[PDB]
Amino acid sequence: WTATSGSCKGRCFELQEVGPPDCRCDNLCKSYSSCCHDFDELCLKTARGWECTKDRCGEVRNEENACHCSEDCLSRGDCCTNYQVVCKGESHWVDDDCEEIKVPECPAGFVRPPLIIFSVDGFRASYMKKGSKVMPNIEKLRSCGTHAPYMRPVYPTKTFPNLYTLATGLYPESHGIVGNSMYDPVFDASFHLRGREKFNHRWWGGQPLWITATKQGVRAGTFFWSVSIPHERRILTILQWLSLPDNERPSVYAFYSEQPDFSGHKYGPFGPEMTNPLREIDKTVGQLMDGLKQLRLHRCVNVIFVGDHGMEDVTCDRTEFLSNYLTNVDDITLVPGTLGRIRAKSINNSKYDPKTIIAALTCKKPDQHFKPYMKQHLPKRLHYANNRRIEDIHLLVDRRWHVARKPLDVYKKCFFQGDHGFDNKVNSMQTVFVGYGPTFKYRTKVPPFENIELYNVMCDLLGLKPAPNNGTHGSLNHLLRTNTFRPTMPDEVSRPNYPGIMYLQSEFDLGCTCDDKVENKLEELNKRLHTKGSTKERHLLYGRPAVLYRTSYDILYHTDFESGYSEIFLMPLWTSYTISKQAEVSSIPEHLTNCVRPDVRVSPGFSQNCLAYKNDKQMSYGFLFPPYLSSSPEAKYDAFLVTNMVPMYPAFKRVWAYFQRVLVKKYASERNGVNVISGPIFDYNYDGLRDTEDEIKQYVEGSSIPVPTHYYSIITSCLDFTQPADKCDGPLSVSSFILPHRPDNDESCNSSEDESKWVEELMKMHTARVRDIEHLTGLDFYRKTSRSYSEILTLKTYLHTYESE
Numbered sequence: 001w002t003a004t005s006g007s008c009k010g011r012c013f014e015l016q017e018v019g020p021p022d023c024r025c026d027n028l029c030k031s032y033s034s035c036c037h038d039f040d041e042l043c044l045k046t047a048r049g050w051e052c053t054k055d056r057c058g059e060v061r062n063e064e065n066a067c068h069c070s071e072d073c074l075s076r077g078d079c080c081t082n083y084q085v086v087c088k089g090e091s092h093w094v095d096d097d098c099e100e101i102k103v104p105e106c107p108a109g110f111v112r113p114p115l116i117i118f119s120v121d122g123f124r125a126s127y128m129k130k131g132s133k134v135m136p137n138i139e140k141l142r143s144c145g146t147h148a149p150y151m152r153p154v155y156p157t158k159t160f161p162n163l164y165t166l167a168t169g170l171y172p173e174s175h176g177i178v179g180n181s182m183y184d185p186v187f188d189a190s191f192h193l194r195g196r197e198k199f200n201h202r203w204w205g206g207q208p209l210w211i212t213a214t215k216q217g218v219r220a221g222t223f224f225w226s227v228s229i230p231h232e233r234r235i236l237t238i239l240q241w242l243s244l245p246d247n248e249r250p251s252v253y254a255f256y257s258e259q260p261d262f263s264g265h266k267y268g269p270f271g272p273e274m275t276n277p278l279r280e281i282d283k284t285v286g287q288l289m290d291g292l293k294q295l296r297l298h299r300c301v302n303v304i305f306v307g308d309h310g311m312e313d314v315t316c317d318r319t320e321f322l323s324n325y326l327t328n329v330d331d332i333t334l335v336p337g338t339l340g341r342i343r344a345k346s347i348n349n350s351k352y353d354p355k356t357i358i359a360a361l362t363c364k365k366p367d368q369h370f371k372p373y374m375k376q377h378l379p380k381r382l383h384y385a386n387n388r389r390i391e392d393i394h395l396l397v398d399r400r401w402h403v404a405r406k407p408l409d410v411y412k413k414c415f416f417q418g419d420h421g422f423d424n425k426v427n428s429m430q431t432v433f434v435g436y437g438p439t440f441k442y443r444t445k446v447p448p449f450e451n452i453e454l455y456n457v458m459c460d461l462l463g464l465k466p467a468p469n470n471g472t473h474g475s476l477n478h479l480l481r482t483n484t485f486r487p488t489m490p491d492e493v494s495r496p497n498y499p500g501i502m503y504l505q506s507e508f509d510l511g512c513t514c515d516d517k518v519e520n521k522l523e524e525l526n527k528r529l530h531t532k533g534s535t536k537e538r539h540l541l542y543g544r545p546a547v548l549y550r551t552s553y554d555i556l557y558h559t560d561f562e563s564g565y566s567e568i569f570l571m572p573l574w575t576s577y578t579i580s581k582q583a584e585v586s587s588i589p590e591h592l593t594n595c596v597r598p599d600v601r602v603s604p605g606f607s608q609n610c611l612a613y614k615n616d617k618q619m620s621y622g623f624l625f626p627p628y629l630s631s632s633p634e635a636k637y638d639a640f641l642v643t644n645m646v647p648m649y650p651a652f653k654r655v656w657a658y659f660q661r662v663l664v665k666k667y668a669s670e671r672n673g674v675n676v677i678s679g680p681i682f683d684y685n686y687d688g689l690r691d692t693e694d695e696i697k698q699y700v701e702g703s704s705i706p707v708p709t710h711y712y713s714i715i716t717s718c719l720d721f722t723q724p725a726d727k728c729d730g731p732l733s734v735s736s737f738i739l740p741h742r743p744d745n746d747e748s749c750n751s752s753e754d755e756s757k758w759v760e761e762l763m764k765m766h767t768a769r770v771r772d773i774e775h776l777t778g779l780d781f782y783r784k785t786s787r788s789y790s791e792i793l794t795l796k797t798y799l800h801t802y803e804s805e
């Protein structure tokens with residue numbers, strides 16, 4: 001109950017929120033049924049519209065008008081945004097040449113440049129080029145400030161997950177807003193866009209920018225606007241707040257637009273009806289910038305123009321129906337649309353079984369436009385699993401498509417021509433970023449980056465210390481003129497051992513055999529130097545990775561590769577090798593097919609054994625440095641060392657063998673040499689973080705050899721590909737992957753065919769950032785390069801997406 005009989009007199013859009021049953025005058029009251037009786041009248045004035053005209057110039061202040069053109073309006077801070085243009089012969093901000101803002105030019109009393117976040121829903125990245133003729137204010141921000149060709153949203157590419165990621169720097173799985181619709185089984189509550197439950201604080205995790213600012217003594221405007229408050233009024237309110245006294249004035253502000261998303265749903269991303277909503281957004285930007293110029297703040301404020309997601313063409317006839325796959329369709333709840341989430345309709349039903357649901361949804365139709373997943377098998381790059389609100393069964397829906405439970409659901413809900421929510425690597429889902437202001441660079445283009453990074457930068461822009469988040473702080477330093485954050489490399493926690501020859505062959509009883517007792521004074525001194533790290537500068541190009549947790553491990557040197565061998569997990573954490581453009585692929589000789597050799601540098605007790613693999617009917621083994629790429633028949637023996645061996649399902653060996661036999665060499669030809677670092681990942685609790693040994697759920701039968709959940713590789717070369725990977729003078733180029741270690745290839749519908757028809761497609765799907773691999777392994781790569789650390793941070797956040805332009 002609200003006693004809505006108090007007044008909003010002088011309280012319009014108050015920044016602090018009052019405790020009911022006192023009525024509220026903040027820009028949230030509408031949504032709570034709690035506005036004072038006189039809110040509309042006093043706070044939502046509209047008399048005479050939004051623009052000064054010639055005859056209103058110097059008028060007598062009439063307090064009923066929406067905005068003012070009277071003489072005193074500037075010092076009252078409530079002029080219409082075009083006042084100076086109409087009544088003082090000023091020019092519009094968009095008609096002025098841009099001039100570098102080298103330093104903040106702020107009125108006295110400003111202790112820091114304010115930050116204004118202008119967020120636009122559904123603003124697809126290509127609108128910047130395609131709509132450029134009708135968006136002159138946005139185009140001026142873009143060309144004069146710092147801009148990216150696009151900004152990658154988070155998955156799912158829905159509105160609240162992304163806005164809250166912008167505000168917190170967190171993956172939806174960590175902040176908790178994992179969709180536009182959700183069920184929390186601990187609360188036993190649901191969350192929908194309509195309604196009031198979305199306002200309960202228990203849904204919203206992490207620490208959003210407005211709370212970060214408040215806790216550190218920076219005042220914030222609101223980050224939420226009631227849908228009925230028109231855009232002109234939101235601008236005028238921000239401009240009014242900017243005129244408060246030094247002690248009351250916020251330092252950070254947010255504007256939000258429902259457009260062009262609202263229209264994109266009805267008409268499609270490029271429907272002819274879309275030109276007008278782009279015109280109108282641009283006009284709103286014009287009003288803000290003219291408003292800032294009037295207050296002499298247009299060379300003082302940092303402005304971020306940022307989208308939450310793009311928009312794709314989607315119609316009702318492109319709907320796949322679960323009723324065409326399942327007979328039990330009434331025992332399930334589907335969260336539908338551009339992604340699928342499935343749970344049991346009732347937890348009393350113990351005859352509900354996720355395994356048979358997945359099987360009934362897997363490769364059932366020739367052109368199937370979705371793919372089912374246990375959430376833990378989703379591409380690690382999506383970071384979409386570690387939250388009780390994310391259902392165990394997920395469907396990744398193809399771009400342009402919908403999934404629904406039954407046809408009745410679609411026609412008893414064609415309405416729409418556009419939607420979003422798809423995989424965040426999809427081009428149509430990309431959105432925009434422009435930074436304009438004293439703290440951003442002048443006329444600078446930066447490479448595409450992910451919206452998880454912005455929270456750190458907004459904290460930098462405001463002199464705040466960011467709460468712990470998923471950005472990599474310093475990876476966006478190149479956007480900024482000043483205020484950069486000077487990060488330091490994390491300290492190595494465990495130093496390695498460097499074992500020499502310490503064990504006789506006959507101390508090993510591992511059940512391993514090798515045809516290798518076939519017999520020099522030149523070439524024994526040679527092989528000794530190789531084992532001491534003579535070729536290490538060839539194969540370890542950027543230094544050895546640092547181990548950032550407490551563990552016991554050995555560096556092992558070889559002619560063709562170097563490894564960091566874990567005595568705890570009985571395999572390498574990392575293996576590093578360089579393959580030059582000239583290198584040749586050979587095969588495994590027949591006498592060596594099943595050869596595994598003891599490593600006399602490493603004790604029996606810290607080794608794998610062949611017998612476990614023999615006894616384990618499901619589990620076979622592969623090698624991290626591939627025998628196929630050995631530099632010589634004699635160096636090939638090193639590849640069969642028990643310390644280069646890792647556990648692999650036969651189904652996964654098809655993938656691995658193709659990557660190692662065909663793809664590595666392909667990349668080295670295309671890229672002019674590559675450096676490769678490969679290894680195992682253990683993420684049994686799917687939190688995106690390295691497992692400790694007591695978290696391992698599966699071992700090679702009858703042994704202590706833990707089974708990886710994934711295998712990674714990091715493939716580095718010279719960005720200037722006229723220089724070979726091993727002799728590169730400037731910036732690097734990287735692509736990486738985290739392949740799921742699965743006992744079947746059910747994920748690849750074409751897997752019964754030749755690996756050349758499906759393997760590379762699978763790897764592309766599981767593309768990753770080096771930074772994803774660092775979280776999963778506790779390692780830190782690129783420790784010794786000739787590049788600045790900020791540049792390396794940017795490289796570590798890079799994702800190779802395999803989309804076209």
Ligand SMILES: *[C@@H]1O[C@H](CO)[C@@H](O[C@@H]2O[C@H](CO)[C@@H](O[C@@H]3O[C@H](CO[C@H]4O[C@H](CO)[C@@H](O)[C@H](O[C@H]5O[C@H](CO)[C@@H](O)[C@H](O)[C@@H]5O[C@H]5O[C@H](CO)[C@@H](O)[C@H](O)[C@@H]5O)[C@@H]4O)[C@@H](O)[C@H](O[C@H]4O[C@H](CO)[C@@H](O)[C@H](O)[C@@H]4O[C@H]4O[C@H](CO)[C@@H](O)[C@H](O)[C@@H]4O)[C@@H]3O)[C@H](O)[C@H]2NC(C)=O)[C@H](O)[C@H]1NC(C)=O
Pocket residue numbers: 170171173174175176202203204205206383386387388468469470687688689775
């Ligand atoms: C992306 O960045 C983020 C932020 O840096 C990373 O997430 C962090 O990961 C940390 C490591 O896992 C984690 O630290 C844990 O914190 C526990 C305290 O949790 C509270 O405090 C934090 C900080 O204020 C707060 O944010 C938390 O809020 C979570 O929970 C509520 C819901 O309950 C949500 O509203 C909120 O959104 C958030 O949810 C998310 O996090 C939790 C995990 O905390 C997930 O379960 C959710 O699904 C969701 O993703 C909390 O209010 C603390 O208790 C933990 O400590 C246990 O484990 C350690 C190991 O060191 C042990 O030593 C401790 O003693 C303790 O163990 C005891 O409890 C165990 C579990 O009950 C038990 O098994 C043992 O036997 C012991 O008795 C731990 O320190 C931190 O909370 C999150 N922060 C956030 C915001 O998510 C994330 O990893 C990054 N992602 C990637 C890929 O890099």
Ligand SMILES: O=C(Nc1ccccc1)c1cc(S(=O)(=O)N2CCCCC2)c(Cl)cc1Cl
Pocket residue numbers: 117119159160163164166167198199200201204223224254255256
């Ligand atoms: O992050 C948000 N806005 C946003 C706007 C621009 C740029 C980035 C983010 C956001 C804030 C609110 S809230 O402030 O009202 N709130 C949050 C926590 C307590 C419950 C009610 C709500 Cl309900 C929804 C969103 Cl999406």
Ligand SMILES: [Ca+2]
Pocket residue numbers: 682683684685686687688689690691
């Ligand atoms: Ca883990």
Ligand SMILES: [Cl-]
Pocket residue numbers: 156158178179180181335
């Ligand atoms: Cl959703």
Ligand code: NA
Pocket residue numbers: 613614615616617618619620
């Ligand atoms: Na086996």
Ligand code: NA
Pocket residue numbers: 745746747748749750751752
């Ligand atoms: Na298959």
Ligand SMILES: [Zn+2]
Pocket residue numbers: 122159261262265420
């Ligand atoms: Zn939308």
